[PDB]
UniProtKB/Swiss-Prot annotation:
Impact when changing residue 321 to A: Retains the ability to associate with HDL particles
Protein name according to UniProt: Platelet-activating factor acetylhydrolase
Covered residues, full protein: 55 to 427 of 441
Reaction(s) the record says it catalyses: a 1-O-alkyl-2-acetyl-sn-glycero-3-phosphocholine + H2O = a 1-O-alkyl-sn-glycero-3-phosphocholine + acetate + H(+); 1-O-decyl-2-acetyl-sn-glycero-3-phosphocholine + H2O = 1-O-decyl-sn-glycero-3-phosphocholine + acetate + H(+); 1-O-dodecyl-2-acetyl-sn-glycero-3-phosphocholine + H2O = 1-O-dodecyl-sn-glycero-3-phosphocholine + acetate + H(+); 1-O-tetradecyl-2-acetyl-sn-glycero-3-phosphocholine + H2O = 1-O-tetradecyl-sn-glycero-3-phosphocholine + acetate + H(+)
Physiological role: Lipoprotein-associated calcium-independent phospholipase A2 involved in phospholipid catabolism during inflammatory and oxidative stress response. At the lipid-aqueous interface, hydrolyzes the ester bond of fatty acyl group attached at sn-2 position of phospholipids (phospholipase A2 activity). Specifically targets phospholipids with a short-chain fatty acyl group at sn-2 position. Can hydrolyze phospholipids with long fatty acyl chains, only if they carry oxidized functional groups.
Post-translational modification: N-glycosylated. Macrophage-derived PLA2G7 carries sialylated complex-type N-glycans that hinder its binding to HDL particles.
Induction info: Up-regulated upon monocyte differentiation toward macrophage lineage.
Record gene name: PLA2G7
Amino acid sequence: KIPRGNGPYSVGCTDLMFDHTNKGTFLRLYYPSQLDTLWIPNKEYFWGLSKFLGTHWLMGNILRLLFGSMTTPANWNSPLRPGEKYPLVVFSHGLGAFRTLYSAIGIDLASHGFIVAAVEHRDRSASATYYFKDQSAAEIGDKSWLYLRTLKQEEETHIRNEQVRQRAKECSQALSLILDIDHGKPVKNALDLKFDMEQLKDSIDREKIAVIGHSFGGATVIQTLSEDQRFRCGIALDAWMFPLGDEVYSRIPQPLFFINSEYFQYPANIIKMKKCYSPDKERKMITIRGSVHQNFADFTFATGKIIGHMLKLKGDIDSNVAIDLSNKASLAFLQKHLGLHKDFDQWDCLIEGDDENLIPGTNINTTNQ
Ligand SMILES: CC(=O)Nc1ccc(S(=O)(=O)Nc2ccc(Oc3ccc4ccccc4c3)c(C#N)c2)cc1
């Protein structure tokens, strides 16, 4: 029940791991293709989700039975659509998520002509992820799993900041890998999938790179922008600003778009967003009325209305309407600041919060002094 992309391009999906260690890059790629992709491809992700939610062994298996064969609307290993160079989005997941849980966003961007690299972070913020201990292990698919670390309260400030720095490093590394493939670097996918990465040679518009992320990933957008001038702009979906150091807020040259849910936000968090503002920098913010934190992630589509509200997976707003607004506003912002030659400027009003379901900026107030 994950919505198909609303753009005119058909969408393909594949996975890339290189190198095979936990210091290598692991991403899911959504791309314009020339609808059978497994949404959550391994049992360990469900076990990891169960740990994240604070439940035991049995819950893991329950989630697996429920969602284990569910797909997402992208053609698995379909050939890349040839003939044109695509803008690139690197996408960062929230705490307790992993690379496949933002396919509603990834697939919609791909359907509008983007290549999207959804990274899987190895900072121990993912519910689960894996790597291979050596080439031999990779060759027989012998995975080594890393589960989410839970932190003591005294540890939080320090570790979350180290994690967001590791996350920014992984977004940059993912960018570097894709740009190297674009220029013909041979890569041996540690996964042995029927998609040839040589397809990506000369397929990237190297001047049109953006970073997008949700929650922890929203902080990662800001840290990545600050560290990596190759990214041209950023969109932070309901950013959780806590992991960032005080020094970073004034060190974001690139245009930045905050798209917030209504019920997630709170003054301490909003204050840090406003610290990113400067008269000489491009900043936009909107809030989606009635939305909750999880409106940006795929489990907002995975259940019925009533159980969804109980689990805080759904807000007062409809999940399709909310992701539509976010995606369309994102496309307009990307067109404006990547210099895209598309018709996304039809949604320019959404950047300004000009819609019944949008608030310009935020309803939360904070000191300006
Ligand atoms: C209390 C708390 O920290 N909360 C929290 C913090 C961060 C996030 S996140 O950034 O969206 N990261 C994130 C983490 C896990 C995710 O899968 C879920 C989420 C909730 C579930 C509830 C019932 C059954 C299955 C579920 C599976 C999804 C998704 N989509 C996204 C989500 C919730």
